DNA sequence: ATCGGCTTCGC
DNA sequence: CGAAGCCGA
């Protein structure tokens, strides 16, 4: 007799959704809900491309709920107060949602659940964004993994859950019920501008559930077979481009796994099978970092290891500015930074290259780079972004190798014809690939393009010195 | 507990 | 071919 509310946050789809399917099993009067949260939307680390993608996903989710039989309610404000209020005025029997791993989200959920319980309303929180929940993957000693290799061995051996059913034949709220909650609702989904953002840089995959599923299918039917080694070349469209869809849950993780598994089963070569397996390992890397953040929330605050907590970063603002403005004088680095600010996305090889460059060559606190990435990435995700940056600065629980990438080596290896470089640095197409890769461009040929802001070999030595020196004095 | 193994590499 | 010490079975 009472409606059940499903609260969407980062699972913007109707298909293969654990919490949603569970709620549907309890009632056909399943009403979706999304709460535009100022604490998230107005954070210093928000990207316009990310909000644009989100907004697009919400537009489709509203449509999907309408076709299913009910609707997606939209609220704006603090969910701790709005969600319980909505559930009460609606006399909802329960509120379902999928758990997250981020500190803010988990804290928020604790408050909402508590408020609901006090109101006598059931709050059900299920795991959905991961193939295996955090407490499901532990070492022999029953503790979380800090090393990927072992985590993967465990993770890959675990039986894989299959996609759940999409809810259908829903029952909408009555006109009276809508009247009772009207005061708490937004009449319409605000435009991107109304949310305080502007974006026309495009996306790696169009927003929404439909486009995410389409990309998954297309990727698994062709390109996935060549993932290894095509994944290493930024000039090639060798990766899935699904990152924002996985971040916001426009696609279910079980459906993604199923599609990759299917391609593997129908593969006719060891090369193809290897490529597909490598892509599956990337999905495991995603879970590794999410699990890590869940088990060790302090990771979000910075270096876990005492050594890196004391590292004497040079922090020359002029160098950071040059990095953010793609004016480093290092073509491969500048091209990557241009792709990021202009399109809200960066190939993984380049994310490693520019992160290494910022921390090792410019010797700037990686946390500055972490923030800048969150300010531009359409797929900006605390767990994965913090994981990537700490990896680049090698700041884990124990001493790890100094991963000092050589920009020229990287470019020669992964962009041998400077195709990617020329694509994002069109002003340098007249320069020979050889010089774009080495970074040695004659003054008259750079036509305004900056000379290298630092010397790699020299900076490499200066960084190692700082390191060893501290490793000694500590 | 000994010991294989440690995403992404430079030289 | 040493990675930085040490996780994980
Ligand atoms: C410094 C740095 C910052 C990063 N920031 C983010 C971020 O904010 N959000 C994010 O999702 N990824 C981040 N990455 C990881 C990786 O670069 C991106 O997931 C990838 O570029 C997404 O593109 P894709 O969809 O084509 O990838 P694919 O190669 O198609 O991989 C499929 C999916 O696997 C996951 N995945 C792949 N590689 C990784 C990885 N290394 N870590 C975690 N998940 C991975 C993603 O969800 C991705 O969509 C970062 C990496 C580094 C080195
Ligand atoms: O519930 C919400 N979740 C939003 N999310 C999803 C969240 O990450 C989610 O609430 C997490 O659980 C927070 O820890 C966003 C994610 C982004 O990357 C960018 C913007 C948003 C905005 C919201 C929002 O307004 N409301
Ligand atoms: Mg230790």
XYZ file of C-alpha atoms (C1' of nucleotides) and ligand atoms in Angstrom:
574
model
C 0.000 0.000 0.000
C 3.021 2.252 0.543
C 5.443 3.228 -2.218
C 9.092 2.223 -2.178
C 11.688 4.852 -3.003
C 14.932 4.045 -4.782
C 17.618 6.645 -4.254
C 20.016 6.959 -7.194
C 23.430 8.568 -6.734
C 26.037 6.894 -8.949
C 23.948 4.121 -10.535
C 22.081 6.155 -13.141
C 20.386 3.323 -15.003
C 17.411 0.996 -14.669
C 19.179 -2.103 -15.992
C 21.404 -4.491 -14.008
C 20.941 -2.567 -10.749
C 21.098 -4.687 -7.562
C 19.326 -2.333 -5.180
C 16.721 -1.400 -7.763
C 15.925 -5.029 -8.602
C 15.700 -5.826 -4.887
C 13.267 -2.959 -4.380
C 11.178 -4.079 -7.356
C 10.835 -7.518 -5.766
C 9.136 -5.767 -2.842
C 6.780 -3.471 -4.754
C 5.635 -2.327 -8.189
C 5.112 1.204 -6.889
C 8.826 1.877 -7.182
C 9.667 5.564 -7.453
C 13.145 6.759 -8.383
C 14.815 9.676 -6.622
C 17.907 11.820 -7.213
C 19.060 14.640 -4.945
C 21.235 17.398 -6.429
C 23.711 17.845 -3.576
C 25.363 21.260 -3.025
C 28.157 19.662 -0.975
C 29.160 17.743 -4.088
C 28.161 20.083 -6.903
C 29.822 23.127 -5.324
C 33.015 21.373 -4.253
C 36.316 22.866 -5.364
C 37.061 19.610 -7.186
C 34.139 19.556 -9.642
C 34.528 19.434 -13.429
C 32.051 20.979 -15.845
C 32.403 17.996 -18.178
C 31.490 15.703 -15.299
C 28.393 17.672 -14.350
C 27.394 17.808 -18.023
C 27.698 14.032 -18.279
C 25.705 13.604 -15.065
C 22.983 15.960 -16.268
C 22.716 13.972 -19.496
C 22.444 10.679 -17.597
C 19.661 12.146 -15.459
C 17.725 13.287 -18.503
C 17.685 9.710 -19.802
C 16.908 8.196 -16.394
C 13.828 10.436 -16.123
C 12.716 9.161 -19.530
C 13.421 5.553 -18.548
C 11.304 5.824 -15.396
C 8.445 7.397 -17.353
C 8.414 4.507 -19.813
C 8.693 1.957 -16.999
C 5.527 3.263 -15.393
C 6.500 5.757 -12.689
C 8.923 8.663 -12.426
C 12.257 9.988 -11.190
C 11.733 12.537 -8.423
C 14.268 15.359 -8.366
C 15.307 17.179 -5.187
C 17.948 19.812 -4.552
C 19.619 20.248 -1.194
C 20.970 18.258 1.743
C 19.782 14.638 1.402
C 20.138 14.092 5.159
C 17.061 16.257 5.585
C 15.318 16.058 2.250
C 15.278 12.264 1.822
C 13.786 11.481 5.248
C 11.303 14.331 4.805
C 10.267 12.987 1.420
C 9.917 9.439 2.730
C 7.697 10.675 5.571
C 5.313 12.930 3.634
C 5.040 10.023 1.229
C 4.696 7.487 4.050
C 7.111 5.270 2.147
C 7.567 1.760 3.500
C 11.246 1.762 2.599
C 14.097 3.547 0.874
C 16.592 1.490 -1.108
C 19.985 2.521 -2.464
C 23.370 1.131 -3.409
C 26.347 1.563 -1.096
C 29.396 3.608 -2.040
C 33.036 3.608 -0.927
C 33.732 7.337 -0.586
C 34.068 8.982 2.860
C 31.456 11.667 2.125
C 28.961 9.249 0.639
C 29.275 6.703 3.432
C 28.946 9.386 6.113
C 25.908 10.817 4.326
C 24.332 7.370 4.023
C 24.846 6.711 7.712
C 22.930 9.891 8.572
C 20.116 9.196 6.122
C 19.667 5.597 7.270
C 19.660 6.691 10.906
C 17.072 9.399 10.220
C 14.899 6.913 8.343
C 15.115 4.281 11.072
C 14.052 6.883 13.610
C 11.064 7.658 11.389
C 10.207 3.969 11.328
C 11.155 3.702 7.662
C 13.247 0.790 6.423
C 16.577 1.661 4.785
C 18.180 -1.033 2.633
C 21.727 -0.529 1.356
C 23.103 -3.048 -1.132
C 26.401 -3.449 -2.957
C 26.040 -2.834 -6.677
C 28.936 -0.967 -8.296
C 31.429 -3.771 -7.711
C 31.528 -7.373 -8.872
C 32.770 -8.189 -5.364
C 32.183 -6.053 -2.270
C 35.161 -4.898 -0.127
C 34.626 -7.439 2.651
C 34.362 -10.208 0.071
C 38.000 -9.881 -1.025
C 40.480 -10.370 1.829
C 43.911 -11.976 2.265
C 44.605 -15.210 4.115
C 44.935 -13.187 7.306
C 41.495 -11.683 6.726
C 42.899 -8.258 5.905
C 42.636 -6.001 2.847
C 45.241 -6.287 0.086
C 47.821 -3.546 -0.490
C 49.362 -5.307 -3.483
C 47.431 -5.750 -6.730
C 48.923 -9.047 -7.875
C 47.553 -11.078 -4.918
C 44.282 -9.141 -4.966
C 43.808 -10.055 -8.616
C 44.569 -13.745 -7.980
C 41.834 -13.819 -5.346
C 39.413 -11.568 -7.228
C 39.618 -13.388 -10.562
C 39.007 -16.798 -8.949
C 35.807 -15.668 -7.239
C 32.563 -16.734 -8.940
C 31.170 -13.827 -10.970
C 27.642 -12.546 -10.304
C 25.326 -12.335 -13.298
C 23.291 -9.275 -14.413
C 19.990 -8.728 -12.608
C 16.618 -7.904 -14.165
C 15.459 -4.471 -15.281
C 12.319 -3.399 -13.376
C 9.117 -3.217 -15.425
C 5.398 -2.489 -15.066
C 5.835 0.140 -12.377
C 3.013 1.921 -10.580
C 3.208 5.717 -10.457
C 2.366 7.927 -7.493
C -1.209 9.180 -7.281
C -2.077 12.818 -7.961
C -2.760 13.206 -4.233
C 0.636 11.798 -3.288
C 2.330 14.122 -5.760
C 0.489 17.014 -4.141
C 1.644 15.940 -0.688
C 5.328 16.085 -1.691
C 5.223 18.901 -4.254
C 6.971 21.389 -1.890
C 10.044 19.147 -1.734
C 10.395 18.598 -5.471
C 12.081 20.361 -8.345
C 9.526 20.905 -11.122
C 12.073 20.031 -13.789
C 15.653 18.903 -14.260
C 17.746 22.065 -14.308
C 19.862 22.838 -17.359
C 23.639 22.632 -17.094
C 23.742 26.429 -17.017
C 21.209 26.508 -14.190
C 23.494 24.145 -12.271
C 26.244 26.720 -12.737
C 28.319 25.101 -15.468
C 29.039 25.295 -19.188
C 30.474 22.551 -21.387
C 30.739 21.987 -25.118
C 33.855 19.836 -25.182
C 32.064 16.566 -25.873
C 32.399 13.178 -24.164
C 34.282 9.860 -24.586
C 30.841 8.193 -24.745
C 27.519 10.053 -24.938
C 25.676 10.420 -21.624
C 23.107 7.879 -20.542
C 22.371 4.218 -20.138
C 21.495 3.593 -23.791
C 24.754 4.974 -25.171
C 26.771 3.163 -22.490
C 25.270 -0.200 -23.444
C 25.807 0.596 -27.127
C 29.489 1.381 -26.532
C 29.961 -1.773 -24.459
C 28.491 -3.893 -27.260
C 30.536 -2.219 -29.965
C 33.746 -2.437 -27.961
C 33.275 -6.109 -27.104
C 32.391 -7.021 -30.655
C 35.624 -5.623 -32.123
C 38.204 -3.400 -30.428
C 38.459 -5.438 -27.227
C 40.187 -8.169 -29.236
C 43.120 -5.804 -29.849
C 43.134 -4.124 -26.421
C 46.579 -5.563 -25.825
C 48.630 -3.806 -27.071
C 46.404 -1.130 -28.651
C 45.564 0.151 -25.160
C 49.047 1.688 -24.898
C 48.809 4.098 -27.859
C 47.027 7.410 -27.167
C 46.704 8.203 -30.887
C 44.570 5.087 -31.267
C 40.999 4.648 -30.044
C 42.071 1.389 -28.437
C 40.210 1.709 -25.128
C 36.486 1.561 -24.300
C 35.851 5.173 -23.379
C 33.409 3.855 -20.764
C 35.006 5.512 -17.719
C 32.273 8.106 -17.063
C 29.618 5.431 -17.596
C 31.247 3.227 -14.982
C 31.791 6.150 -12.618
C 28.111 7.164 -12.718
C 26.770 3.661 -13.244
C 25.181 4.338 -16.636
C 26.205 0.710 -17.216
C 26.061 -2.155 -14.705
C 29.344 -3.808 -13.768
C 27.863 -7.302 -14.137
C 26.647 -6.487 -17.644
C 30.110 -5.152 -18.515
C 31.753 -8.294 -17.162
C 29.261 -10.506 -18.986
C 29.976 -8.753 -22.285
C 33.734 -9.137 -21.908
C 33.303 -12.771 -20.841
C 31.109 -13.365 -23.881
C 33.728 -11.950 -26.233
C 36.301 -14.211 -24.582
C 34.099 -17.295 -25.074
C 33.611 -16.534 -28.766
C 37.242 -15.554 -29.360
C 39.207 -17.616 -31.881
C 42.777 -16.673 -31.017
C 45.082 -16.588 -28.017
C 45.865 -12.947 -28.807
C 42.216 -11.942 -28.634
C 41.734 -13.960 -25.444
C 44.766 -12.252 -23.929
C 43.448 -8.801 -24.869
C 40.059 -9.480 -23.320
C 41.691 -10.811 -20.160
C 43.784 -7.647 -19.926
C 40.636 -5.507 -20.148
C 39.072 -7.587 -17.382
C 42.133 -6.879 -15.258
C 41.440 -3.160 -15.703
C 37.998 -3.749 -14.222
C 39.785 -5.426 -11.311
C 42.092 -2.405 -10.947
C 38.960 -0.308 -10.589
C 37.772 -2.573 -7.775
C 41.231 -2.619 -6.183
C 41.241 1.143 -5.762
C 37.625 1.322 -4.661
C 38.223 -1.403 -2.100
C 41.354 0.403 -0.922
C 39.481 3.648 -0.339
C 36.756 1.741 1.510
C 39.232 -0.006 3.805
C 41.532 3.006 4.172
C 39.505 6.237 3.892
C 42.561 8.249 4.947
C 44.013 7.626 1.482
C 41.833 10.516 0.314
C 43.711 12.905 2.603
C 47.105 12.224 1.085
C 50.241 10.039 1.484
C 49.663 7.080 3.788
C 53.368 6.405 4.231
C 55.217 8.616 6.711
C 58.043 9.150 4.218
C 55.854 10.795 1.583
C 53.978 12.738 4.230
C 57.269 14.559 4.780
C 58.579 14.806 1.213
C 59.948 18.339 0.603
C 57.972 19.294 -2.503
C 59.460 22.289 -4.304
C 56.014 23.604 -5.231
C 57.085 26.367 -7.627
C 53.758 27.910 -8.609
C 55.129 29.004 -11.983
C 55.865 25.389 -12.887
C 52.408 24.221 -11.820
C 50.759 26.956 -13.866
C 52.770 25.910 -16.914
C 51.686 22.310 -16.381
C 47.985 23.221 -16.126
C 48.200 25.467 -19.197
C 50.028 22.939 -21.369
C 53.042 25.265 -21.589
C 55.723 22.859 -20.333
C 57.726 22.720 -23.541
C 57.358 18.922 -23.495
C 55.090 18.080 -26.480
C 53.756 14.759 -25.190
C 52.908 16.390 -21.853
C 51.368 19.511 -23.359
C 49.318 17.511 -25.850
C 47.892 15.441 -22.981
C 47.051 18.477 -20.882
C 45.277 19.997 -23.896
C 43.214 16.831 -24.410
C 42.217 17.008 -20.738
C 41.051 20.627 -20.559
C 39.489 20.640 -24.021
C 37.678 17.289 -23.848
C 37.485 16.377 -20.158
C 39.258 13.067 -20.773
C 42.825 11.790 -21.089
C 44.165 8.478 -22.336
C 45.567 6.379 -19.464
C 49.110 6.303 -20.869
C 49.075 10.090 -20.848
C 47.622 10.307 -17.340
C 50.679 8.391 -16.159
C 53.037 10.522 -18.208
C 51.740 13.887 -16.975
C 51.413 12.709 -13.385
C 55.013 11.508 -13.387
C 56.063 14.763 -15.002
C 54.335 16.892 -12.354
C 55.668 14.976 -9.354
C 59.130 13.947 -10.587
C 60.108 16.660 -13.073
C 58.373 19.695 -11.609
C 58.571 18.306 -8.084
C 55.127 19.547 -7.130
C 52.937 17.919 -4.464
C 50.878 15.341 -6.378
C 47.824 16.500 -4.469
C 47.806 19.637 -6.654
C 47.684 17.410 -9.729
C 44.993 15.232 -8.167
C 42.788 18.273 -7.671
C 43.365 19.673 -11.153
C 42.395 16.312 -12.614
C 39.150 16.312 -10.604
C 38.490 19.823 -11.899
C 38.487 18.649 -15.524
C 37.873 14.897 -15.772
C 34.478 13.676 -16.983
C 35.331 10.418 -15.194
C 36.912 12.063 -12.153
C 36.579 9.491 -9.376
C 38.110 9.865 -5.911
C 39.103 6.209 -5.588
C 40.645 5.824 -9.042
C 42.121 9.312 -9.293
C 43.677 9.206 -5.839
C 44.917 5.706 -6.619
C 46.488 6.809 -9.887
C 48.186 9.834 -8.380
C 49.563 7.963 -5.368
C 50.896 5.337 -7.760
C 52.655 8.021 -9.804
C 54.177 9.467 -6.647
C 54.681 5.935 -5.334
C 53.094 6.720 -1.968
C 51.715 3.433 -0.654
C 51.996 1.710 2.726
C 55.561 0.662 1.969
C 58.561 1.889 -0.065
C 57.960 1.436 -3.784
C 60.245 2.015 -6.811
C 60.803 5.541 -8.050
C 58.763 5.442 -11.236
C 60.423 8.311 -13.050
C 59.054 8.251 -16.577
C 61.188 9.704 -19.357
C 58.824 11.802 -21.528
C 60.942 11.296 -24.652
C 61.121 7.533 -24.126
C 57.378 7.404 -23.535
C 56.610 9.407 -26.661
C 58.957 7.325 -28.808
C 57.419 4.108 -27.497
C 53.758 5.035 -27.495
C 53.461 7.825 -30.084
C 56.269 6.918 -32.501
C 54.926 9.098 -35.306
C 53.829 11.961 -33.048
C 50.293 11.461 -34.344
C 48.764 12.071 -30.914
C 51.069 15.022 -30.279
C 50.159 16.709 -33.559
C 46.476 16.029 -32.961
C 46.424 18.092 -29.769
C 49.221 20.516 -30.654
C 48.162 21.485 -34.208
C 50.479 24.503 -34.035
C 53.413 22.065 -34.229
C 52.409 19.980 -37.271
C 55.240 21.519 -39.297
C 57.767 20.029 -36.874
C 59.334 16.652 -37.655
C 57.985 13.824 -35.432
C 61.531 13.052 -34.356
C 61.870 16.479 -32.724
C 58.375 16.430 -31.232
C 59.230 13.151 -29.543
C 62.670 14.233 -28.304
C 61.279 17.606 -27.298
C 64.188 19.366 -28.984
C 62.552 21.952 -31.230
C 64.606 24.760 -32.752
C 63.743 28.267 -31.465
C 62.589 29.449 -34.884
C 60.456 26.343 -35.334
C 58.599 26.570 -32.028
C 56.967 29.813 -33.205
C 55.861 30.803 -29.719
C 55.669 27.274 -28.318
C 57.653 27.383 -25.025
C 61.111 25.896 -24.590
C 61.329 23.077 -21.998
C 60.557 24.619 -18.593
C 62.958 22.172 -16.929
C 65.663 19.692 -17.917
C 64.529 16.098 -17.353
C 67.899 14.526 -16.527
C 68.782 17.327 -14.131
C 65.396 17.262 -12.403
C 65.507 13.467 -12.262
C 68.773 13.723 -10.350
C 67.505 16.499 -8.097
C 64.401 14.474 -7.188
C 66.316 11.283 -6.403
C 68.642 13.320 -4.195
C 65.712 14.692 -2.205
C 64.345 11.164 -1.890
C 67.468 9.316 -0.723
C 68.304 12.240 1.550
C 64.947 11.905 3.309
C 65.023 8.110 3.258
C 68.226 8.572 5.233
C 66.974 11.314 7.545
C 63.921 9.357 8.678
C 58.775 -18.876 7.444
C 61.353 -18.997 3.331
C 60.920 -16.843 -0.980
C 58.394 -15.869 -5.624
C 56.785 -11.715 -7.158
C 55.814 -6.726 -7.347
C 50.764 -2.520 -14.202
C 51.927 0.971 -16.624
C 60.297 1.436 -16.657
C 64.918 3.702 -17.536
C 69.251 2.722 -19.540
C 68.912 -6.014 -15.348
C 68.224 -3.285 -10.100
C 63.891 -1.479 -9.149
C 62.411 -0.639 -2.420
C 61.820 -3.201 0.759
C 58.366 -6.387 1.947
C 53.674 -8.281 0.925
C 51.250 -12.739 0.762
C 50.805 -17.749 0.572
C 47.039 9.910 -12.432
C 45.862 9.079 -12.865
C 44.552 9.547 -12.630
C 43.425 8.815 -13.009
N 42.151 9.302 -12.764
C 41.031 8.490 -12.963
C 39.739 8.893 -12.553
O 39.526 9.996 -11.994
N 38.698 8.015 -12.797
C 38.840 6.768 -13.415
O 37.873 6.055 -13.592
N 40.095 6.383 -13.815
C 41.164 7.214 -13.600
N 42.417 6.798 -14.034
C 42.523 5.395 -14.532
C 42.486 5.269 -16.062
O 43.373 6.203 -16.624
C 41.078 5.519 -16.609
O 40.104 4.669 -15.984
C 40.943 5.288 -18.124
O 41.714 6.268 -18.829
C 39.468 5.375 -18.508
O 39.311 5.238 -19.921
P 38.661 3.977 -20.626
O 37.248 4.018 -20.229
O 38.933 4.046 -22.087
O 39.487 2.740 -20.109
P 39.556 1.159 -20.436
O 40.963 0.860 -20.762
O 38.500 0.909 -21.425
O 39.212 0.418 -19.057
C 37.851 0.034 -18.758
C 37.475 0.579 -17.387
O 38.362 0.034 -16.413
C 38.586 1.006 -15.375
N 40.034 1.278 -15.300
C 40.968 1.173 -16.311
N 42.193 1.479 -15.900
C 42.041 1.798 -14.573
C 42.967 2.202 -13.585
N 44.254 2.355 -13.802
N 42.478 2.455 -12.318
C 41.139 2.309 -12.056
N 40.205 1.923 -12.952
C 40.702 1.678 -14.194
C 37.703 2.210 -15.744
O 36.474 2.233 -15.045
C 37.592 2.092 -17.236
O 36.507 2.768 -17.823
C 43.585 7.527 -13.662
C 44.895 7.050 -13.904
C 46.028 7.799 -13.520
C 47.397 7.224 -13.811
O 23.588 12.153 -4.798
C 24.276 12.810 -5.561
N 25.432 12.329 -6.133
C 26.306 12.983 -6.997
N 27.466 12.427 -7.505
C 27.721 11.100 -7.266
C 28.500 10.901 -6.037
O 29.876 10.688 -6.203
C 27.924 10.141 -4.838
O 26.971 10.821 -4.082
C 28.915 9.509 -3.856
O 28.313 8.501 -3.066
C 29.601 10.541 -2.951
O 30.540 9.984 -2.035
C 28.259 13.253 -8.311
C 29.458 12.769 -8.791
C 30.262 13.555 -9.558
O 31.450 13.040 -9.984
C 29.895 14.863 -9.898
C 28.688 15.368 -9.424
C 27.887 14.586 -8.637
C 26.700 15.101 -8.131
C 25.897 14.323 -7.295
C 24.691 14.944 -6.768
O 24.267 16.080 -6.972
N 23.957 14.111 -5.913
Mg 54.412 -2.660 5.793
